Amino acid sequence: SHMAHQDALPRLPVPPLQQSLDYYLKALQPIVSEEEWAHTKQLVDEFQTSGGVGERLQKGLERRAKKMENWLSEWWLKTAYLQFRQPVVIYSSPGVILPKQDFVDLQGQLRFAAKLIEGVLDFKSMIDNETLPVEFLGGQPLCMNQYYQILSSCRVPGPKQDSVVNFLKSKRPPTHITVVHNYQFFELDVYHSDGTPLTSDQIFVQLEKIWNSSLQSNKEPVGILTSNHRNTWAKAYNNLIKDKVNRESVNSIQKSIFTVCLDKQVPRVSDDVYRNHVAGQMLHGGGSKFNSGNRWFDKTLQFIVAEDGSCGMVYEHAAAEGPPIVALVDHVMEYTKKPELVRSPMVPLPMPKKLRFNITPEIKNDIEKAKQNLSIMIQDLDIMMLTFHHFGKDFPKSEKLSPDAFIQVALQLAYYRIYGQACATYESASLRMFHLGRTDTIRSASIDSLAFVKGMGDSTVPEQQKVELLRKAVQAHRAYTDRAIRGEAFDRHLLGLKLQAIEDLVSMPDIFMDTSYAIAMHFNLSTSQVPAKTDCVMAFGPVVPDGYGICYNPMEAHINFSVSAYNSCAETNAARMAHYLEKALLDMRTLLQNHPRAK
Ligand SMILES: CC(C)(COP(=O)(O)OP(=O)(O)OC[C@H]1O[C@@H](n2cnc3c(N)ncnc32)[C@H](O)[C@@H]1OP(=O)(O)O)[C@@H](O)C(=O)NCCC(=O)NCCS
Numbered sequence: 001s002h003m004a005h006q007d008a009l010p011r012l013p014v015p016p017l018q019q020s021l022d023y024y025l026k027a028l029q030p031i032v033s034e035e036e037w038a039h040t041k042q043l044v045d046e047f048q049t050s051g052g053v054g055e056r057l058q059k060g061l062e063r064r065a066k067k068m069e070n071w072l073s074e075w076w077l078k079t080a081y082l083q084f085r086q087p088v089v090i091y092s093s094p095g096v097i098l099p100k101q102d103f104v105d106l107q108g109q110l111r112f113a114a115k116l117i118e119g120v121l122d123f124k125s126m127i128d129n130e131t132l133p134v135e136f137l138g139g140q141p142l143c144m145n146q147y148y149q150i151l152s153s154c155r156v157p158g159p160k161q162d163s164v165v166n167f168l169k170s171k172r173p174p175t176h177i178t179v180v181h182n183y184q185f186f187e188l189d190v191y192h193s194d195g196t197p198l199t200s201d202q203i204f205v206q207l208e209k210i211w212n213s214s215l216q217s218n219k220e221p222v223g224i225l226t227s228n229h230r231n232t233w234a235k236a237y238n239n240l241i242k243d244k245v246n247r248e249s250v251n252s253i254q255k256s257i258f259t260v261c262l263d264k265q266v267p268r269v270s271d272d273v274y275r276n277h278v279a280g281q282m283l284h285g286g287g288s289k290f291n292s293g294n295r296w297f298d299k300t301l302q303f304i305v306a307e308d309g310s311c312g313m314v315y316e317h318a319a320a321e322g323p324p325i326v327a328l329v330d331h332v333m334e335y336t337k338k339p340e341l342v343r344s345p346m347v348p349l350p351m352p353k354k355l356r357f358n359i360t361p362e363i364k365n366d367i368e369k370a371k372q373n374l375s376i377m378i379q380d381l382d383i384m385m386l387t388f389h390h391f392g393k394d395f396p397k398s399e400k401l402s403p404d405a406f407i408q409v410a411l412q413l414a415y416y417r418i419y420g421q422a423c424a425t426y427e428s429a430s431l432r433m434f435h436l437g438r439t440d441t442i443r444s445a446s447i448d449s450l451a452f453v454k455g456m457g458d459s460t461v462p463e464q465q466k467v468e469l470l471r472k473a474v475q476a477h478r479a480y481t482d483r484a485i486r487g488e489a490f491d492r493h494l495l496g497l498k499l500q501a502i503e504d505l506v507s508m509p510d511i512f513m514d515t516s517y518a519i520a521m522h523f524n525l526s527t528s529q530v531p532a533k534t535d536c537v538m539a540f541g542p543v544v545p546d547g548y549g550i551c552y553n554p555m556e557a558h559i560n561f562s563v564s565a566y567n568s569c570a571e572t573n574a575a576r577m578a579h580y581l582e583k584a585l586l587d588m589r590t591l592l593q594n595h596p597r598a599k
Pocket residue numbers: 137320321322323393396397398399400401402403404405428429430431439481485528529530
C-alpha cells in the first residue's frame with residue numbers, strides 16, 4: 001500500500017550548519033565581487049560561532065524535524081506558491097507542449113480527446129488502487145505523494161494567501177471531469193453508475209454533445225478571471241460565488257478529476273514562429289481573443305487539445321513538479337496509441353450538464369480587468385522554442401559525461417559569451433528520495449564553471465587545456481547534483497534558517513540581509529530538466545524581470561528546449577540566448593571531438 005511505502009522512506013534531513021555555509025561561500029565566489037565576498041565571509045564566521053545566532057537557529061530546525069514528517073514541506077509550499085501573489089499564469093504554472101497529433105477535423109480532435117481522457121482514467125486506476133510502480137533516483141525509492149495531489153484537486157484564491165482543495169479521497173470521490181469549449185464549462189461523468197469507467201467511444205459521444213451545446217462563442221470568458229493577480233482574483237472569486245449557480249459551477253470545476261480544453265481554430269501564423277505560438281497557447285492561451293478564456297488556471301491539471309492537432313497542458317504548480325506530470329503524460333500518450341478494441345453497441349448516455357454563470361456588471365468588469373492584465377502579461381513574454389537536433393544524451397554519454405551537467409555547463413558558457421560574467425543560476429533538483437520531498441537548488445554557476453567559460457573564450461589557452469576545464473566543470477556539477485538529491489545542498493537549508501529566525505521572533509540575521517544573499521537568490525537563469533519518453537517539452541516564465549526561464553527534455557538523439565524572457569528588460573532576448581545555447585553545445589562537442597580521450 002501507499003502508506004507502507006511512505007513510512008519506509010527516510011525523512012528530510014537538516015544539513016550541518018557549517019557544511020552548508022561552506023558550500024554557500026563557494027557558490028558565491030563566481031557571482032559576487034571580491035569585496036562583497038570578503039564581507040560575507042566575515043558574516044558567516046560570526047553567524048556560525050559557538051553560542052551564536054546560527055547555532056540556535058540550526059537547533060530550532062533540528063527540533064522542527066523531530067516534530068514534523070518533513071521540516072520543509074509547509075514552509076516551501078507556502079513561500080514558493082501559496083504566498084506568491086503574482087498570477088499563476090506564466091509566472092508559476094508550467095505549460096506542457098506535446099507532440100502534434102494527426103487528426104484533421106472535428107471528428108479526430110474529439111476522438112483523440114476521448115482517448116486521452118480514457119488514458120488519464122486508466123492512470124488514475126493505479127492511483128486509486130495504490131498500484132502505481134515505485135520510482136527510483138540514484139538507486140533510492142521515491143516519494144509518491146505528488147501523485148495523490150494532482151487529480152480531483154484545485155487551487156483556491158485567498159485574500160492573504162491561497163489554499164488547495166483535494167477531493168481524491170473524500171467520502172464521495174468525484175466521478176466527473178470538466179470540459180470547456182468556447183469558454184463554456186460542462187460537467188461530464190466519466191464513470192458508470194456501476195463504478196466502471198466510460199470507454200473512449202462513449203466519451204466521444206459525450207464530447208460530441210458538449211461541442212454541439214457550445215457552438216456559440218458569445219458567453220463571457222469567466223475563466224480568464226483565474227489569470228489575474230492573486231489578490232485581485234481573490235476578491236473577484238469571492239464576488240463570483242455569491243451567486244447560487246455560479247458557486248455550484250465553480251464547485252464542479254474545483255472537484256472535477258481534471259479539465260479538458262477543446263480550443264478553437266486560431267489565425268494561421270508564419271512557420272518560423274509556429275512552435276513559439278504553440279508554446280504560448282499551452283502556457284497562457286494566446287489572449288482574450290483566442291483560448292485564454294477557455295481555461296480555469298486554478299485547476300491542477302488542464303489538458304489542451306487544439307483545433308489544428310496541437311496539444312499539451314498547463315498544470316498548477318502547488319501540487320507537484322514536472323516528473324510526476326510527465327509520468328502521467330507518458331502513460332497517457334502511449335495509451336492513445338493502443339489498438340481499437342471491438343466496441344459493443346452504444347448504451348444510453350445522459351446529457352453532460354452545462355455549468356452556467358450569471359454575469360453581473362461587476363463580474364463583467366472583473367472579466368475586462370482580467371483581459372487587460374493578461375494582455376499586458378502576454379505582450380511582455382518573449383519565447384523561443386529550440387529543437388536541438390544535433391545530438392542528445394548520446395554524445396555526452398559517449399564522452400563519459402553527465403548529459404544534464406553537459407547541458408548546464410553549455411548554458412553557463414552561452415550566458416558568459418553574451419554577458420561577460422556569470423550569474424546566479426537555479427536548476428531544480430528532486431528531493432523525492434525523502435518523505436514528502438519536493439525540490440532543492442542545484443547552483444550551476446560555480447568556481448569550476450567560471451574557470452571553464454573564461455578559458456573557453458581565451459584565445460591564449462590551448463584546446464587540450466580547455467577540455468580539462470570542461471570535464472572539471474561537468475564533474476563539479478554532477479557532484480553538486482548528487483549532494484542536492486541527497487538533501488546535502490544548502491538553498492532550502494538557508495531558507496529554513498531564515499524562516500526559523502522569523503518564527504523565533506529574533507532580529508533578521510545579517511547574513512540574510514547581506515547583498516551577497518540578495519544576489520545569490522536573484523536567478524537571472526532559472527532552469528529545470530523534465531525527462532520524458534514522450535517527445536514533449538515544458539516552459540515557464542523567468543523568475544526575475546531581467547532573467548530567463550529555460551526548460552529542456554534531453555532525449556537520446558536530440559534535446560527539446562524552451563527559452564523565455566521578458567521584453568521589459570532590454571538586456572534579455574530569448575532568441576539570442578537560444579542561439580548562443582545551441583552554439584555553446586556544438587562548440588563543446590567540437591572541442592571534445594578534437595581531442596579524443598584515447599589519443
Ligand atoms: C538533476 C537531475 C535532472 C539529474 O538527472 P540524471 O538522470 O542524473 O541526469 P544525467 O544528465 O546524469 O543523465 C542520466 C543518463 O545519462 C547517464 N549518465 C550520467 N552520467 C554519465 C556518465 N558520466 N557517463 C555515461 N553516462 C552517464 C545515466 O546513466 C542516464 O542514462 P539513461 O539515458 O539511460 O537514463 C535529477 O537528479 C533531478 O533532480 N531530476 C528532477 C528535476 C525536476 O524536478 N524537474 C522539474 C522541476 S518542476
